Design a protein around this ligand. Structure first.
Ligand SMILES: NC(=O)C1=CN([C@@H]2O[C@H](COP(=O)(O)OP(=O)(O)OC[C@H]3O[C@@H](n4cnc5c(N)ncnc54)[C@H](OP(=O)(O)O)[C@@H]3O)[C@@H](O)[C@H]2O)C=CC1
Ligand SMILES: NC(=O)C1=CN([C@@H]2O[C@H](COP(=O)(O)OP(=O)(O)OC[C@H]3O[C@@H](n4cnc5c(N)ncnc54)[C@H](OP(=O)(O)O)[C@@H]3O)[C@@H](O)[C@H]2O)C=CC1
Lengths: 326, 326
């Protein structure tokens, strides 16, 4: 089998393809021959050292879809031959064969392809807990969502529309703005050209917003707090431009007795029952075509070109999801 | 009239009594002959410069209770002779006569004395919003509340008890622990001698709590976060030992996808209607004896002794509220 691994932290150039022989699964694991592998921004945090792995050398990626080749002795709910997707495996999904704790994998419905599954499983579960659990978005509600033409962004646009809500997205270029509107964003502010705070006040009739979903981190921190109503909720869930550090809590007071939370998938999708309820929702929305997750051909890369996938992702030149094909 | 004022930021010595002549109330103001003045930890942040005032020299205090001497034209709900309390005046309540924007004052029912009112208005309004709005405490709920024998603390112990909840308080001495338990704390932890986190887990049988109310700030930040369940709420509402600065938001993820808020009274009691709602609930509790707010005779100081009152407050040698008497 082939897997990608890195022996030191650094830029995309530290990623290296290496041959190996997969071990049989533990009693509570299943072995999967990967058909499509998801790329996620957290993959770059781990590679660069912002999030250090358990140890080096290390594999990468926790998301992939494929066919179960073998099953551990204790595994009862899954069998060889089944089609599955997973978003939370031990590091190493950037591989042609990976072993995964069986409670973390979901059985893929026939209507959903491996490429569709790996393009949207981790990101869709994220959109689901963000809009339904962290804060419950209601019909007609206007709210802000950063980086709206990205992997998570484009899914967020479609889910918000399906909910009948009014997502105001931010994007870095004019073409991203169009993709976001096409996906379902009510209005879009280009935060590299416009004045985000003033446009947001204009768009909301001066009322501002009750919740801000911000994955960009460092660059938008202050601007996002300024788009919030008294006692509003700031959801910091990404570090795309850098982590948010050095904050004085007094600022939450000054800005209006605001709330802030910094969630992760692990904090919300913890049991098999949770993974199941969320997958059922997600899968039904993709199968019914309410959420489109097809991937641009230019954004599909051979597994061995994991390095080019990262350079491209980091350069901000993508829209929607990317994939690695084993 | 006599008022306390300071010409430069510093410790308690910076405060001085000066005679002055009261300006007539503005149109929307009422002039009050103060009978009892409140002491609040925030007064020290302003004096020390942590919360710098509009300009120097500056007056101090925003809480007092008294009799209305002269009403402004425009003022229609308060009449001369009315007894009132306020918690949100402009800086300067440390005075025998003060002008206050009428919307900030509430009529003080006869059964409640001026000392009782100035001992509990700002602090009682605070406990009301913290336990009823910032997070709604339920019957039988276990939660952590720091500095439980202080001004806000002793009122919190009593209200929590009235709510049927289980407040777990932290105090600095064994004597404060007895006071808190008598006031109504379910259990108390001496955070100067014990391991707060281990004691909290013990008391909760490993479950931990869903909410932590923390007015101490700097010293207890990391420990408070360690006392929370997944997705719990950290309410940082004070800076007794210093502001909480230099935070990296990743800590909220790391500790369990937590929420944090830094509220202030002005973020919650914003209109006359909100003030009336809160104050009616507080007044009934005091009138019925559910919340006792009688101040220790050694914690009543002459107005000119503002310096001593501050020294003593900062030394941690007080329990419950303190009053300045003009
Ligand atoms: N907390 C959770 O549970 C999860 C958090 N996340 C986080 O969500 C975010 C989105 O992830 P994903 O869908 O994989 O990625 P994206 O495909 O959305 O790519 C990131 C996008 O972020 C925007 N961005 C702004 N500034 C920068 C910058 N300086 N460098 C790079 N990108 C920047 C760019 O769009 P533009 O050019 O329009 O500004 C870019 O395309 C990431 O921050 C990720 O870590 C993802 C999943 C779950
Ligand atoms: N956000 C808001 O709306 C409001 C916030 N507050 C804040 O709540 C807190 C309580 O105010 P109040 O009731 O007036 O004050 P207290 O009477 O409770 O005095 C503060 C208590 O804080 C504890 N403490 C811990 N470390 C220190 C320290 N280093 N220095 C001094 N005290 C320390 C001490 O008790 P022990 O010795 O047991 O530790 C002290 O007695 C203050 O921080 C105030 O700023 C008050 C009202 C409203």
């Amino acid at each position: 089998a082939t897997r990608i691994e890195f022996h030191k932290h650094g830029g995309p150039e530290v990623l290296q393809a290496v041959e190996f022989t997969p071990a049989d699964p533990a009693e509570n694991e299943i072995q999967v021959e990967n058909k499509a592998i998801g790329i996620n921004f957290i993959d770059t945090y781990i590679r660069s050292g912002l999030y250090p792995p358990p140890s080096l050398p290390s594999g990468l990626g926790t998301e992939a879809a494929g066919i179960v080749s073998k099953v551990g002795s204790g595994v009862k709910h899954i069998k060889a031959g089944d089609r599955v997707v997973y978003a939370q495996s031990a590091l190493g999904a950037y591989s042609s064969v990976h072993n995964i704790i069986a409670d973390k994998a979901a059985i893929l419905p026939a209507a959903i392809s491996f490429e569709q599954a790996a393009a949207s499983f981790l990101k869709g579960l994220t959109v689901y807990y963000l809009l339904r659990k962290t804060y419950e978005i209601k019909p007609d509600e206007q709210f802000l969502f950063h980086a709206a033409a990205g992997g998570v962004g484009l899914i967020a646009c479609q889910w918000a529309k399906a909910l009948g809500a009014k997502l105001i997205g931010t994007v870095g270029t004019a073409q991203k703005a169009q993709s976001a509107l096409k996906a379902g964003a009510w209005q879009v502010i280009n935060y590299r050209e416009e004045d985000l705070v003033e446009r947001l006040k204009e768009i909301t009739g001066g009322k501002k917003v009750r919740v801000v979903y911000d994955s960009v981190g460092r660059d938008t921190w202050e601007r996002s707090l300024d788009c919030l109503q008294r006692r509003g909720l700031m959801v910091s869930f990404g570090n795309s431009s850098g982590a948010v550090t050095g904050v004085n809590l007094g600022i939450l007071n000054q800005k209006g007795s605001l709330y802030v939370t910094r969630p992760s998938l692990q904090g919300y999708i913890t049991t098999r029952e949770e993974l199941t309820e969320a997958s059922n929702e997600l899968f039904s929305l993709i199968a019914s075509g309410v959420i489109k997750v097809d991937v641009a051909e230019q954004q599909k890369y051979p597994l061995k070109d994991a390095q080019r996938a990262h350079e491209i992702l980091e350069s901000r030149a993508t829209q929607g999801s990317s994939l690695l094909i084993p």
